[model samples]
Target: AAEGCTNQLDICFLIDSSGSIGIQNFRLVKQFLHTFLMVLPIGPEEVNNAVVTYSTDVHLQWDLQSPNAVDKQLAAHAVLEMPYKKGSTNTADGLKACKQILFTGSRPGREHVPKLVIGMTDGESDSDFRTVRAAKEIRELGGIVTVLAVGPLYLRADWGQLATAIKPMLKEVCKTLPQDAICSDWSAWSPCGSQIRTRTEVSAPQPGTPTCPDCPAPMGRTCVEQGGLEEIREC
Candidate 1:
């Protein structure tokens, strides 16, 4: 059997809203979330989700089935109210926030199973040590932390080294989902924070881009294959 398997799973996505991402890319991130969530296996009782977005600071976008349900419509309204904004890439802050969301109070009727955190970033993080440490804490709490390296094919060697340094920490927090699973496709990126206004007629998946069964292709973003895995050095 795989090392960590559980009956229930709580998945949270941490998207990069740093200044480096352009307006088009910024909007793409939101569109990515919308498509991803809309495509998720939705059932009233299976799982529960909470989103915590970070740039310079971290913010909790939406918490589901909280307090008491005013009505089913209220749930949809909550999601619509959430906004996507860009900021500095404080990966450490994002990790800290995600840890809280995972361990926070339970939803009304959903089973709280294994906690899964999927962190997606274009390049290396500024706060390496803190992010690694946070990943460790999440794992210790029985949560799985996955990372997606978005953008270009050539990852900066020095930054790649930094990523390697934190691999052990990430490995601890995440279970076996192919280390690549933590790393998302390159298609998730664009020029930092630039807004992408898609015409209604555009119809979700642009043209030839591969669609992730659940989510649409992130706006102006294309998926790139993972080159290979290398050893990360300690800072």
Candidate 2:
């Protein structure tokens, strides 16, 4: 297990199940989720878990307070065996659904525990503005948001655009890039590696780069210039 695995948390996963993701990519996502759960000490008193899968419509796979719902084994099984429910890419609605999950009173003493949203998406959305606003609202409500972009070339391009679009808002609300966003290759699943890549690597812009007005500054800047490490929190 990585660091902070035992910390008490109310964690919710917001996954994009749009048609573009396809069945194979969806399975990869589920595998990643299973591995993610394996690394944490999940339980009612440890890491309370919930999942909301969305496309054009958001579906609550499970809620934190559902009977026997917070168990690690059950959650892992649910994710592993879950079928792909595909539709349009409605990421904003997904974010809003996660917000509802995070702010609810279903989980015990949630007000005092750390709140986290693990957002995973495959492509561009029709409601980028609404999604960004919802993310900012989550941060304002004291929920730590970590977004993951998973899939191939076009998906990656969309990821870069979304990351750049949300950069300024994230920098304003959070202390560092790692706390704010992550872009990952579809082949592997490693949160730490994703963090390292965001800070140390940059992908070349394609022939028609989508507008990314506020992509992060150069990596040479010190922790102070980038916003001190002390103020940042891992998702």
Candidate 3:
């Protein structure tokens, strides 16, 4: 987190609605957003958020930066209620739209921190060179470009390298970039630094504790999956 940075964080979500992502996985992505918003500290008082879904085309589902009516609850509801519009994956266009949403309508005040832009996608872009240009533009406009790799899949080498090469772009926008900007797996992501796995100091498990079903052998043990959401607990 940037120290003493009170500037409103404009988090623009660029989601992948391509058919390859599938309806079920797309819903899971939506659920993640809902959960993040429920716990996320963004609101009229703090940060602001917007949603833009992309496949072959880019569509802005909600623009919450309106000065007269910037409501988090309403924005979240609108995002959840929006229908899935699937087509080819236009990741570059999606990113470009996100950048526009950041600078659109003119936000007052200019703090040191730039806008926070997160682009979630599962596959590679059709045109790698064009996406690089888009990434460059986003960096120039004071926006951080994050590419989430969703599931167990790798993007094309050229596009992947483009994103990696532009890491400094996001860092330049916001001085505090997380260690893993390009998250290969969704299961291992957390803003808070509490997502590390570790074993207990004691060698024995507590009495009457349930052992691992797979390992029924008598050995006192218990494994814990920390960091990120362990099992999606509601706050």
Candidate 4:
């Protein structure tokens, strides 16, 4: 629900607990984490999650290696009870810590899954140079990093608007569910380097079941009807 995505996600949360937020607002941040967990279909197989809380110090509160990291109630309890660190905003360090844990070659199935890093910050980081540097490292490594600004200058509506626009872009990938991918048979190598395969996909409820006996009729006129078809590769 956080993002209308059908695919499994690998999300890393970087939460800010600077003294500026105080204890009351920090409670909301905990709720934010809990609500986020509930919205997304989380599991070791569905979503791999990690959390890093920081201010002057970075705390590895939860990560993939933690006991059932995707267990909503278990993880939520761990985060909700995390003491408010209360110090200067060292977001740059937080990002750097996130990078260290995320890309350390320890994550299973890391290569094929999409990687996302979401950070919540109340104010500016203590050092801009390190923040930008660390943030760039994440992007360079094919990771998406988003810094959520929560301060007086930025309004609550601004955050809502941001999530609204993001849903469409991410939702585009969610087309349908278990609506699994169908690939054609293997192909003859063009020069024998490695065998290539075709991925058969549906076009239109979105229609993907109907023998090709009708052929021409179904494939013509209402091109939309073409979706009721399937094709193969060289093999």
Candidate 2 is scored at a TM of 0.60
Tell me the tens digit of each residue's lDDT in model 1 across 137-202. Answer: 776554555665555111221322333424343344333321211223223223333522221111
Question: By TM-score, how accurate is candidate 3?
Answer: 0.57
What local lDDT score does residue 170 receive in model 4, on the 0 to 100 scale?
Answer: 32
Q: What is the lDDT of residue 140 in candidate 2?
A: 63
For model 2, state the Cα shift of residue 71 in Å.
0.8
Least accurate 10 contiguous residues by lDDT in model 2: 201-210
Off by over 4 Å in 3: 1-7, 66-69, 109-113, 126-131, 152-235
C-alpha RMSD for every candidate: 19.9, 14.5, 17.8, 12.9
**Best lDDT among the predictions, by candidate number:** 2
lDDT tens readout by residue for model 4, 85-191: 88977777888887776776225654434455767666565234224788767655655565555541112213333343234323432321112233244334443
Relative to the true structure, how large is the alpha-carbon lDDT of every model? 0.49, 0.58, 0.53, 0.56
lDDT of 2 by residue, 1-235 (tens): 1111214567788888889988877877787778677766687666788888987788888878874347888788888877688889877878888788778745765554556677777546533522478876766665666656654011232332433424333232123212212222323323651232223212221111112333322122233333332232244
Q: Which stretches of candidate 4 lie over 4 Å from their true place?
A: 1-6, 126-131, 152-235
What would the per-residue lDDT of candidate 3 be over residues 1-235, giving only the tens digit for each residue? 2321232466777888998877777776676566556544565545677788988888878764553225656665665675788788888787778777776633453232245666666646533412467766665554555555655112222322433423343344333322111112234333342443223322222221111222221111222311232334222
Clashing pairs in 4: 182-200, 204-207
Model 1: residues with Cα > 4 Å off, grouped in runs: 1-7, 64-84, 108-112, 126-131, 152-235
TM-score per candidate? 0.53, 0.60, 0.57, 0.63
Most TM-score-accurate candidate: 4
Error of 3 at 232 (Å): 46
Full candidate order by TM-score, most accurate first: 4, 2, 3, 1
